[PDB]
Design a protein around this nucleic acid. Structure first.
Lengths: 110, 117, 154
RNA sequence: UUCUCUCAGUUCGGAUUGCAGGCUGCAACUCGCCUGCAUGAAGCCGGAAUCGCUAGUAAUCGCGGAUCAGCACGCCGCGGUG
């Protein structure tokens, strides 16, 4: 439900609808669909229950879930609680890579 | 009402406004308008277009009582005096006389100071 | 300029139909100097015209041009601090200029999925006295022949 | 030149952040350039006002080198479509 996590959209090909799960970009969808042998054919998801379970069991071997948000979150969490120059900036809404703040924070500070 | 079908247009056009009243062949008034009564303000009350739409708003009501015959007596040494006429004919009325009525004293009364702008 | 009038910028009649008007129409569709795209667009549009309820692309195009071009344009001027507008006549080259301009501008704003599905459709709607181009012409004629009031002695 | 995609904040856009690398240099934390995978912001043609340009010009597309281990959306030139 649908094929991973929740709710892969309808009416589109699989190589694009598989993008909508957090952790599957564009080349990852290609590689997943190629390790099985599923094409697009043509601009719809009219799969089979063998094709859905096929492309469902392989996603389990990746980190495409709220198991990834945990990793990213605890990474920034480890950053801000040691020193830390990067985390100090993470705690101010300021660019954390060196960006000469004259305009380059409208993204990072609204 | 009264199905008059005759009258005379009075145009009173100064430097900073314009009034057109249409009365019958004698005195009593039927329909009028002016640039101020059309939402215009300040400077614009003296452009001809104001006189255009004011003439229209007067005609459209004067011929809502039956009216063809009209004359034009123009007071008011201003600018849009002829735009008033061009709107007076081209929305239905039957202009047949133009006359100028401008008070000209024979040297009687004394006019105000000259402005130092 | 200040010295005096200037030349007229001779054009090179396109070889397909041998018509300088199609050349100017290609030149008006073109953006950024990508001319082959503009040529493909015009030729696909004419193919679409003839194939669907058509006789020849030159004929219906000329008639659409005739129905769109203006004949009375006004010019807003300044005198001494107050500005107005007055009608005037219209010389021939300006007429075809305006015609092409309006047709392309209002085909570009149609809302279908191809510039050809827009251009062919719009000049067909134009050769039948329809479309915002014809309405633009009539707006112009209505502004004129009214604002002649403060133009009668200009 | 073919094959796709179908008017959507999208197979548009590529800011920001996580992880893993490469290169120069004695050394890239403050403070370099580049690569890959993941994330996917504002932005749907911009008021008052204001700028450049008269023909291979405007508009658009790339290439080279001065400076320089490394480091260019800047500068100087070149040509293509027009």
């Amino acid at each position: 439900a649908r094929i991973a996590g929740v709710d892969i959209p309808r009416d589109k090909r699989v190589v694009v609808s598989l993008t909508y799960i957090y952790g599957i970009g564009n080349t990852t969808a290609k590689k997943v669909l190629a390790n099985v042998g599923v094409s697009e054919d043509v601009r719809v998801r009219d799969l089979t229950n063998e094709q859905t379970d096929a492309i469902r069991a392989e996603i389990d071997k990746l980190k495409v879930e709220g198991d990834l948000r945990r990793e990213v979150n605890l990474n920034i969490k480890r950053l801000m609680e040691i020193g830390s120059y990067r985390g100090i900036r993470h705690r101010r809404g300021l660019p954390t890579r060196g960006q000469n703040t004259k305009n380059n924070a409208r993204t990072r500070k609204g | 009402k009264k199905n008059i079908e005759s009258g005379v247009a009075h145009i009173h056009s100064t430097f900073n406004n314009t009034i057109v009243m249409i009365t019958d062949t004698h005195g009593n008034a039927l329909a009028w308008s002016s640039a101020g009564s059309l939402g215009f303000k300040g400077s614009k009350k003296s452009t001809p277009f104001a006189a255009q739409m004011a003439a229209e708003a007067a005609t459209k009501v004067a011929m809502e009582h039956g009216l063809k015959t009209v004359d034009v007596t123009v007071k008011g040494p201003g600018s849009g005096r002829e735009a008033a006429i061009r709107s007076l004919q081209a929305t239905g009325l039957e202009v047949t006389a133009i006359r100028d009525v401008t008070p000209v004293p024979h040297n009687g009364c004394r006019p105000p100071k000259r402005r130092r702008v | 300029p200040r010295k005096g009038p200037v030349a007229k910028r001779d054009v090179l009649p396109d070889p397909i139909y041998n018509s300088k008007l199609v050349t100017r129409l290609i030149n008006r569709v073109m953006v950024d100097g990508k001319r082959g795209i503009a040529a493909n667009i015009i030729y696909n549009s004419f193919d679409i015209i003839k194939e669907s309820t058509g006789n020849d692309p030159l004929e219906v195009f000329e008639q659409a041009m005739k129905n769109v071009m203006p004949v009375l344009e006004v010019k807003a001027r300044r005198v001494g601090g107050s500005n107005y507008q007055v009608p005037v006549e219209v010389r021939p080259e300006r007429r075809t200029t305006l015609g092409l301009r309006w047709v392309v501008n209002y085909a570009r704003l149609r809302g279908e999925h191809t510039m050809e599905e827009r251009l062919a459709k719009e000049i067909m709607d134009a050769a039948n006295n329809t479309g915002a181009s014809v309405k633009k012409r009539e707006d112009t004629h209505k502004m004129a022949d009214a604002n002649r009031a403060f133009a009668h002695y200009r």
